[PDB]
C-alpha cells in the first residue's frame, strides 16, 4: 500500500505545515503537524479542558473502532516550551489513503497556551523513532512504524512547499518530484531522531567548508539552526544584518537580496535560496526582517528545520538500518 497527502503552510511565513489525518470510524478529519522531531500522535479531543480549546477535536466516543488503552498516559514537552498530556486510545488512522489499524491516538486532557493559540493545528503526528514516544507504561509505535508492514517500501518522503502546498508520501518515491538523484547519508538513532552529519556548508557563491555538522531533520521546526560560527559566516555576507538581543536572533533589512546557503549531503549539495532565508518582517510593515538561519547554541542541537527541508525532496528511509536522502527539486 501507499499514501499521499497534501501539506499546507498554516500562515504566510511557513511557520508550520498541516496535513489532514482521518481518525476513527466514521473518519474524523483533523489537521495535524507532521513532526519528524517527535514520536507522539496526539490530538485535541472531547477530553481536552474546554477553556484550553479554541481547533477541530477528536471524539473517541463517536468512533466505533476506538479502544481505551487501559492504564496508559502520556506527557510531552517540546523545544519551544509547549506541552500537552492525557490518556490513550488505539484507533484506525489514515493518511493520504494509507490506513493503519490499532494506532495509538493520544487524547489531550490538557494543552499548553501556544497550542490553544494556534487555531490551525489540531494536534501532532510524530515521525521520529518510536523510542521517543511518551506513552507509559509501554511506549507506542508511530504511524510510520505501524504502516511499514503494509507499505510498498518502508519509506516516507517530505516535499514541503515554499509559501505553497506540498506533499507527504508513504511507501514510494515519486521520481517526478525532484531533479538529479537522491543522495543518502547515514542516520544515528542513538537519540531517537533522524540524526545525520552534514559534510559542510557554503555561503552564497563562496567556498564550501568541510566541517561535520551533526543535526536532525525536523519538519516540526520552522528555521535552520546551525553552529554559531556557521551562522556568523552567513550573516557576515549580509550588509545590514545584526544579532538582536531583544528580538532573539539575527535581523536584517527586508529589502536585502540574501545569499543562498548550501549544505553538504555526502558529496552532494543542497542549495537553500536566499529568498527562503528571508523569513519575514518582525511585524507587518516593518523594515526589519528575522533571519531564517539562526544559532543552535540555545537549543543545544543543530536542526535542519523547514527553511532547509523545503529546499529539498527528503527521503526518510525506515529500513531496519535507516538512512536519510536528499535531492534538489
Amino acid at each position: 500500500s501507499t499514501g499521499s497527502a497534501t501539506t499546507t503552510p498554516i500562515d504566510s511565513l511557513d511557520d508550520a505545515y498541516i496535513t489532514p489525518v482521518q481518525i476513527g470510524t466514521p473518519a474524523q478529519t483533523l489537521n495535524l503537524d507532521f513532526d519528524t522531531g517527535s514520536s507522539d500522535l496526539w490530538v485535541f479531543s472531547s477530553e481536552t479542558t474546554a477553556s484550553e480549546v479554541x481547533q477541530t477535536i477528536y471524539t473517541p466516543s463517536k468512533s466505533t473502532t476506538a479502544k481505551l488503552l487501559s492504564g496508559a498516559t502520556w506527557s510531552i514537552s517540546y523545544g519551544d516550551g509547549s506541552s500537552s498530556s492525557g490518556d490513550v486510545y488505539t484507533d484506525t488512522v489514515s493518511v493520504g489513503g494509507l490506513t493503519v489499524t490499532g494506532q495509538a491516538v493520544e487524547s489531550a486532557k490538557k494543552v499548553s497556551s501556544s497550542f490553544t493559540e494556534d487555531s490551525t493545528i489540531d494536534g501532532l503526528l510524530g515521525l521520529a523513532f518510536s523510542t521517543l514516544n511518551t506513552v507509559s507504561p509501554t511506549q507506542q509505535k508511530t504511524f510510520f512504524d505501524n504502516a511499514k508492514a503494509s507499505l510498498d517500501s518502508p519509506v516516507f518522503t517530505a516535499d514541503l512547499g515554499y509559501h505553497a502546498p506540498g506533499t507527504y508520501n508513504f511507501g514510494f518515491i515519486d521520481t517526478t518530484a525532484y531533479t538529479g538523484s537522491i543522495t543518502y547519508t547515514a542516520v544515528s538513532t542513538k537519540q531517537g531522531f533522524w540524526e545525520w552529519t552534514s559534510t559542510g556548508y557554503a555561503v552564497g557563491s563562496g567556498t564550501f567548508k568541510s566541517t561535520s555538522i551533526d543535526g536532525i531533520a525536523d519538519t516540526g521546526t520552522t528555521l535552520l539552526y546551525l553552529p554559531a560560527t556557521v551562522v556568523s559566516a552567513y550573516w557576515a555576507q549580509v550588509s545590514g544584518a545584526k544579532s538582536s538581543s531583544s528580538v532573539g536572533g539575527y535581523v536584517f533589512p527586508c529589502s536585502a537580496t540574501l545569499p543562498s546557503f548550501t549544505f553538504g549531503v555526502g558529496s552532494a549539495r543542497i542549495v537553500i535560496p536566499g529568498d527562503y532565508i528571508d523569513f519575514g518582517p518582525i511585524s507587518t510593515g516593518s523594515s526589519s526582517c528575522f533571519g531564517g538561519i539562526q544559532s543552535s547554541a540555545g537549543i543545544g542541537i543543530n536542526i535542519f528545520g523547514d527553511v532547509a527541508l523545503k529546499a529539498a525532496f527528503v527521503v526518510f528511509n525506515g529500513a531496519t538500518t535507516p538512512t536519510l536522502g536528499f535531492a534538489s527539486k
Binding site: 511565513l13 507532521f34 517527535s38 514537552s77 519551544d80 510524530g126 511518551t134 531517537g192 521546526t221 528545520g305
Partner: peptide
C-alpha cells in the same frame, strides 16, 4: 512565529 517541535 517560529515553532520548535521533543525536549
Amino acid at each position: 512565529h517560529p515553532f520548535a517541535x521533543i525536549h
